[PDB]
Amino acid sequence: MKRVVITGLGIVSSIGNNQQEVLASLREGRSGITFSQELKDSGMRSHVWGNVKLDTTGLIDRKVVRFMSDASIYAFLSMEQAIADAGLSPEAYQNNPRVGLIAGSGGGSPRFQVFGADAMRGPRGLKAVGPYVVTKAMASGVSACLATPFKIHGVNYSISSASATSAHCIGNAVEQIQLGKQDIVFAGGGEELCWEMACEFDAMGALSTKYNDTPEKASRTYDAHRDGFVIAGGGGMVVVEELEHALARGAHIYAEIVGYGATSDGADMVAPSGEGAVRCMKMAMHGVDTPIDYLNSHGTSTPVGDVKELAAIREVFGDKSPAISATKAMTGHSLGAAGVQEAIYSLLMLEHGFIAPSINIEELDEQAAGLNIVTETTDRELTTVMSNSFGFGGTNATLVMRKLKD
Amino acid sequence: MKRVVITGLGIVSSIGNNQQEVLASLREGRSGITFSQELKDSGMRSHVWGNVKLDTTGLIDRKVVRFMSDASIYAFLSMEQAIADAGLSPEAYQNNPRVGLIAGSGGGSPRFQVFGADAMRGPRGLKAVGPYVVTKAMASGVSACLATPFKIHGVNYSISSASATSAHCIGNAVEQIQLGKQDIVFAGGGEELCWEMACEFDAMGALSTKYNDTPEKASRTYDAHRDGFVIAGGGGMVVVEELEHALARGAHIYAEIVGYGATSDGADMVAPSGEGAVRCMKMAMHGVDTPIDYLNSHGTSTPVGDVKELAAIREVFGDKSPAISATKAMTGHSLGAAGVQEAIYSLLMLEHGFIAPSINIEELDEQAAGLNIVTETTDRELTTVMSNSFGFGGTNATLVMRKLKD
Numbered sequence: 001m002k003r004v005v006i007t008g009l010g011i012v013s014s015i016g017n018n019q020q021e022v023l024a025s026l027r028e029g030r031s032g033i034t035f036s037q038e039l040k041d042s043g044m045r046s047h048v049w050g051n052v053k054l055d056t057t058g059l060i061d062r063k064v065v066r067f068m069s070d071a072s073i074y075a076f077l078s079m080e081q082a083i084a085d086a087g088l089s090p091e092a093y094q095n096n097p098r099v100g101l102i103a104g105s106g107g108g109s110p111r112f113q114v115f116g117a118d119a120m121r122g123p124r125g126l127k128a129v130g131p132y133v134v135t136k137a138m139a140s141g142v143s144a145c146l147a148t149p150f151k152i153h154g155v156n157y158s159i160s161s162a163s164a165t166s167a168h169c170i171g172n173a174v175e176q177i178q179l180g181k182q183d184i185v186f187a188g189g190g191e192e193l194c195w196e197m198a199c200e201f202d203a204m205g206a207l208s209t210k211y212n213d214t215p216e217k218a219s220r221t222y223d224a225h226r227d228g229f230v231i232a233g234g235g236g237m238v239v240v241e242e243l244e245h246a247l248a249r250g251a252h253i254y255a256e257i258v259g260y261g262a263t264s265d266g267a268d269m270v271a272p273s274g275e276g277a278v279r280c281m282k283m284a285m286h287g288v289d290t291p292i293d294y295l296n297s298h299g300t301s302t303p304v305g306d307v308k309e310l311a312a313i314r315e316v317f318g319d320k321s322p323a324i325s326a327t328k329a330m331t332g333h334s335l336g337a338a339g340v341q342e343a344i345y346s347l348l349m350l351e352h353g354f355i356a357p358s359i360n361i362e363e364l365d366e367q368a369a370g371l372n373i374v375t376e377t378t379d380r381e382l383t384t385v386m387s388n389s390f391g392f393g394g395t396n397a398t399l400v401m402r403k404l405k406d
Numbered sequence: 407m408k409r410v411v412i413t414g415l416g417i418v419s420s421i422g423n424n425q426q427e428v429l430a431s432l433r434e435g436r437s438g439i440t441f442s443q444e445l446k447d448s449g450m451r452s453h454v455w456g457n458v459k460l461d462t463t464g465l466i467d468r469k470v471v472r473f474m475s476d477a478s479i480y481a482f483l484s485m486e487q488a489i490a491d492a493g494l495s496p497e498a499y500q501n502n503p504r505v506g507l508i509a510g511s512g513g514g515s516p517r518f519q520v521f522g523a524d525a526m527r528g529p530r531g532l533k534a535v536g537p538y539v540v541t542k543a544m545a546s547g548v549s550a551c552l553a554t555p556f557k558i559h560g561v562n563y564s565i566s567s568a569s570a571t572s573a574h575c576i577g578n579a580v581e582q583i584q585l586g587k588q589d590i591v592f593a594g595g596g597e598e599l600c601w602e603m604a605c606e607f608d609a610m611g612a613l614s615t616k617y618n619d620t621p622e623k624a625s626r627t628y629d630a631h632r633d634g635f636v637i638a639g640g641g642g643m644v645v646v647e648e649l650e651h652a653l654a655r656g657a658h659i660y661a662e663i664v665g666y667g668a669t670s671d672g673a674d675m676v677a678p679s680g681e682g683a684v685r686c687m688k689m690a691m692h693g694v695d696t697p698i699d700y701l702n703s704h705g706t707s708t709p710v711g712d713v714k715e716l717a718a719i720r721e722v723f724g725d726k727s728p729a730i731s732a733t734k735a736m737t738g739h740s741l742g743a744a745g746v747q748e749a750i751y752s753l754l755m756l757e758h759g760f761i762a763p764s765i766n767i768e769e770l771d772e773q774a775a776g777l778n779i780v781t782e783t784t785d786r787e788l789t790t791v792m793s794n795s796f797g798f799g800g801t802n803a804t805l806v807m808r809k810l811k812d
């Protein structure tokens with residue numbers, strides 16, 4: 001019965017290191033994909049990625065960063081921005097039982113898990129591994145590494161669900177508030193970018209391989225010649241807060257979360273069934289009386305994936321389908337961080353009245369025919385937006401956000 | 407609002423491959439710790455572990471097991487058990503939107519993350535890696551690999567929180583039911599046992615190393631000479647169900663979950679603060695009118711950990727201390743699977759009227775003075791039990807289970 005809003009955001013992504021940079025990129029349809037020497041040298045076929053253009057060296061206190069992996073670093077920087085953007089002072093959120101944190105990653109830290117085994121197998125054994133690998137490699141690193149330094153006393157854990165990870169963290173945060181257990185929950189996620197993890201996707205043929213020479217055109221959701229997704233990394237964090245608590249401190253409210261769906265396909269391990277997506281979106285729209293103005297699709301730019309979701313979208317909206325665009329064409333697929341980052345791109349579109357373009361569509365796929373997929377930045381007043389996140393294991397998450405009435 | 411009960415359980419641990427075996431071990435105070443040739447050969451100082459004494463070969467269909475890591479295999483086997491024990495048939499939990507799964511692990515699969523890296527750096531490259539490493543290495547593997555073959559259509563994700571992982575999974579399941587979103591939720595988790603992961607703990611001096619010659623005495627919670635925990639693996643899974651729905655099908659009810667606490671220390675990265683534990687136990691007890699008869703402590707057998715919890719317990723119960731015993735003294739520390747396995751040991755004690763002994767205590771720690779620590783199997787009619795789980799990153803979880811009035 002309690003209402004939930006988002007009052008702060010922070011983000012470190014392939015298209016910007018803060019909301020101002022991300023905003024500019026979204027408006028210009030600027031690609032964040034670059035050529036990766038690291039990937040080429042690893043022997044992978046996919047040589048493109050959506051990397052965070054930022055040197056994180058010295059940006060975090062040494063006694064804190066020694067426990068963190070990149071996913072944690074990205075999520076940490078995103079949280080610092082979110083706190084600042086939310087206008088929360090230490091005495092408000094620190095050592096407060098009503099303030100928690102729910103953030104996770106898709107793979108934890110393959111890089112440090114491998115570093116650990118490599119070091120152990122060297123002549124120095126244990127001495128070479130060091131005492132900080134566990135907090136870097138454990139799956140809950142993103143939450144453990146942020147909750148501790150920020151003095152969080154409320155809920156503290158990570159939710160992981162492949163590409164839906166950070167979307168579920170936000171949804172669960174919403175539930176914590178609706179249950180009256182928390183007033184504020186920092187929700188988000190992070191994902192490192194490395195060949196140790198990337199090669200695994202390359203091995204199953206999930207990554208784009210035909211456009212290494214033109215990195216900016218590799219990610220091309222809904223294009224007839226898409227050939228897999230482009231791996232990316234980074235972090236994002238949003239401040240999920242109970243409505244009255246937010247109004248009481250005169251917070252800036254981006255939007256209210258009015259719908260959250262989380263379903264399971266129970267079918268295929270790697271491909272969506274579409275059936276689960278239909279249920280997920282319908283569940284998220286239950287109770288939402290206003291139409292969806294814009295839908296930030298999951299669209300990873302994969303042959304099967306993009307169309308399964310388009311079919312699900314046709315079945316749910318029929319002849320009233322919303323404007324659609326896949327930001328992954330610009331950013332790439334950040335996996336664990338995708339959910340929160342795309343929620344942020346959607347909040348920015350809602351806050352600034354515009355629809356980011358779905359770029360790189362030279363030839364539209366037959367199955368996308370008739371849908372209103374925006375291909376050029378369009379100014380427009382949005383009121384209700386939806387964002388999809390579907391991960392391996394048939395896990396689905398959908399978030400619906402709406403502007404707060406005047 | 408709605409009440410929640412546990413109507414089934416499954417388990418695979420160092421002291422038994424099913425509840426019958428576990429009961430026998432618990433009643434006799436038998437250790438599941440053995441010498442590990444694998445750990446010794448890896449170059450570690452700790453050579454003991456709580457291994458699953460079971461050959462999994464052929465226990466799972468080839469088409470399904472090919473996507474799984476050991477954590478998933480253990481959780482999968484535990485779920486089959488739980489389904490049978492709960493008296494559920496396929497059409498009752500399959501393709502059912504009201505039925506979900508929340509299970510996780512603490513480290514995902516260090517073994518396969520390393521396997522992919524090694525394979526990739528080899529003469530075969532991508533071909534040696536194979537197309538199944540992603541689902542084996544991702545942090546959400548335990549939930550993805552179970553929800554797909556069991557045709558789950560409800561919620562589907564993993565919660566990871568170090569040693570508190572499977573405890574938060576159960577608590578989150580309770581919430582999903584209280585929210586009226588699900589009628590049944592399979593909750594639990596698993597953790598693989600391997601040197602790739604173990605060496606990381608040894609590297610930070612967390613594992614027992616002075617008792618390799620006498621494996622069964624290495625894990626000695628509360629003993630003055632404890633020197634770290636003994637790592638273990640395995641899985642566990644419970645059927646969390648809405649009360650009226652369970653009665654309507656004549657299910658066997660082990661107990662009602664009357665309390666669930668989830669807090670954060672916001673203090674130290676590796677050591678509990680004590681304060682967070684206090685708040686967690688008090689939170690789980692709020693509204694529970696009956697006294698706590700038994701407390702299955704976290705007690706990992708570490709110098710600092712064991713006492714912090716003892717201080718917290720004393721802070722919460724003063725002199726009306728409940729009966730206490732650390733089962734890890736017998737089983738070892740199963741990390742991500744500890745939460746659900748220990749909840750299961752407690753349910754068995756509640757079910758069969760006895761208190762499992764806290765073994766290997768030759769010289770009780772002074773700081774344990776004045777507390778009711780049970781060192782010998784005691785038949786006693788139990789009614790309300792509590793189980794603590796505290797993990798790295800200062801994440802806490804407490805579960806309170808009570809017999810249902812006839």
Ligand SMILES: *C(=O)CCCCCCCCC
Nearest residue numbers: 106107162163391392544
């Ligand atoms: C989204 O479901 C695509 C697959 C993401 C898997 C999660 C990351 C795992 C990294 C080892």
Ligand SMILES: *C(=O)CCCCCCCCC
Nearest residue numbers: 138512513568569797798
């Ligand atoms: C409980 O918190 C003890 C430490 C558990 C760490 C998480 C499992 C290991 C991940 C690599």
Ligand SMILES: [O-]
Nearest residue numbers: 338339388389
């Ligand atoms: O997403």
Ligand SMILES: [O-]
Nearest residue numbers: 744745794795
């Ligand atoms: O535990």
